[PDB]
């Protein structure tokens, strides 16, 4: 079990750790989060009480270093940093744990929600999408744009998701125009899976990361990416059966976790109705279709 220690909490803030959130009051004696499960990536995210606009946060893996948060009063945000002095870090964390100044990651024993949301997400792939090579953790906020959003403005602060564009020469083989546009299997299996992602685990990892960025930060570019990756699979007549089964599980847990009051913005009516009711895979996503129909039948 790992720990993220905080130098202090000088400004009132709502703190999020994966799907959990809590409030810290201005100058409250708060020194971080303990009992964080090893073996998964994590995200620690923030929403200032005084300017609810721009959520921001950090993806990290406690196996890759000792990380802590300290507020920066010049830049006005909680920053993640890496302490290279291990003995110093363990001593600090022990002092705060003895004074009981830390909250406890309250994972219920029965509960596989976070695993199920992050099964294919790996820090090394996150760091290729979020380019900031000097740190082992990755900063994301609400306003960051994607490489494709910049094609349609700072490239260093972009999200480098894989560009998916259904009306593009990458997607359409000369002389197979109708075929490839109406059945995207070539683009899914040959271009994207074999060519770019190499395997379906890397594809699912980017899909899950995009959803989580979209839901935690309200990142428009991430939502566009998540939906495009779903739609590419649903619009392919030929998909390996293990990918369809896993996709159904992935989407099931994303829909289950989505806060009901943000479905309006996080779910694209056209993509989902197409995917569940018109596409090649309309009959292949039994779990996802059942939860969507029972939870969000308005959208449909």
């Amino acid at each position: 079990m790992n720990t993220v220690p905080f130098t202090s909490a000088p400004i009132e803030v709502t703190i999020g750790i994966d799907q959990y959130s809590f409030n810290v009051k201005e100058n409250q004696p708060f020194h971080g989060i303990k009992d964080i499960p090893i073996g998964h990536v994590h995200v620690i995210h923030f929403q200032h009480a005084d300017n609810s606009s721009m959520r921001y946060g950090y993806w990290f893996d406690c196996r890759m270093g000792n990380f802590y948060i300290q507020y920066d009063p010049k830049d006005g945000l909680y920053k993640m940093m890496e302490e290279r002095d291990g003995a110093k870090f363990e001593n600090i964390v022990h002092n705060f744990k003895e004074r009981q100044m830390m909250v406890s990651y309250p994972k219920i024993d029965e509960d596989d929600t976070w695993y199920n949301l992050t099964e294919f997400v790996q820090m090394d792939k996150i760091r290729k999408i979020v380019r900031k090579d000097e740190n082992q953790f990755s900063y994301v906020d609400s306003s960051m744009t994607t490489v494709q959003e910049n094609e349609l403005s700072d490239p260093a602060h972009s999200l480098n998701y894989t560009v998916i564009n259904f009306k593009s020469r990458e997607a359409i083989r000369p002389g197979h125009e109708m075929e490839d546009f109406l059945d995207k299997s070539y683009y899914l299996n040959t271009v994207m899976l074999q060519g770019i992602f190499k395997n379906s685990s890397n594809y699912f990892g980017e899909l899950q990361f995009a959803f989580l960025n979209a839901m935690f930060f309200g990142n428009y570019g991430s939502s566009l990416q998540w939906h495009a990756m779903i739609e590419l699979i649903c619009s392919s007549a030929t998909v390996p059966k293990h990918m369809l089964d896993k996709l159904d599980e992935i989407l099931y847990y994303q829909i289950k976790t989505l806060p009901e009051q943000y479905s309006d913005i996080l779910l694209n009516e056209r993509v989902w109705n197409i995917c569940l009711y018109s596409s090649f895979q309309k009959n292949s996503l039994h779990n996802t279709e059942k939860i969507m129909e029972n939870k969000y039948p308005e959208l449909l």
Binding site: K167, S168, R169, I172, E177, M178, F181
Partner: protein, 237 residues
Amino acid sequence: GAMNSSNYAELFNNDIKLFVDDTNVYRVTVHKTFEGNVATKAINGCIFTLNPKTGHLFLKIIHTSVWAGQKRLSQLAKWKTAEEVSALVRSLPKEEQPKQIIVTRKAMLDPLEVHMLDFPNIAIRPTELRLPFSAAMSIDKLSDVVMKATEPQMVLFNIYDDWLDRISSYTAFSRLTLLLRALKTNEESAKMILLSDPTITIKSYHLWPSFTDEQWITIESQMRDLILTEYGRKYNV
């Protein structure tokens, strides 16, 4: 974006453009089978591709053999149309290629856009105009070449005959659309109007009769009457 009444003079500027109409590509007769079911039999069709400034009509004849063994023919027709337009553009010198292609039905946008990915500088546009190009198969000489074709074939026409010698493109297109609207609303009356005078012939190398300026005004007025008439016989006004 979409082409409408507010940008109508754009058609006659010096940027090369083509209208594409696919409404006569896939044509069928519906009939009863010996067992009392219903079947379709295709007949020859055509793509209607028109430069509104010059009158140049690229008429691609769609022979029924192109549907043999194919499924979902109405969807295939839009892609076949897009493939043939793309081939036509590629066959033209660069200086003759269009800067814009305006499709008369929105379902042609994605097929044509996909077939023209090689041409990112060519704008593919819909229109809010309800243009009567479906009635092209009421022009006797065009119907004749389509129904006689025994193989795929491209035929080139000037749909304005020699009118541009005397009138502007804007006026020629207005006349053409008035004639085609009339032929669409009541083909027999429209054709009677156009031929009622045996002394006004259609030249071998033309589609329409050799009307004088004065007679064209008469004709145009009678065609407007017909369109208004039929609009009363239709809505009881």
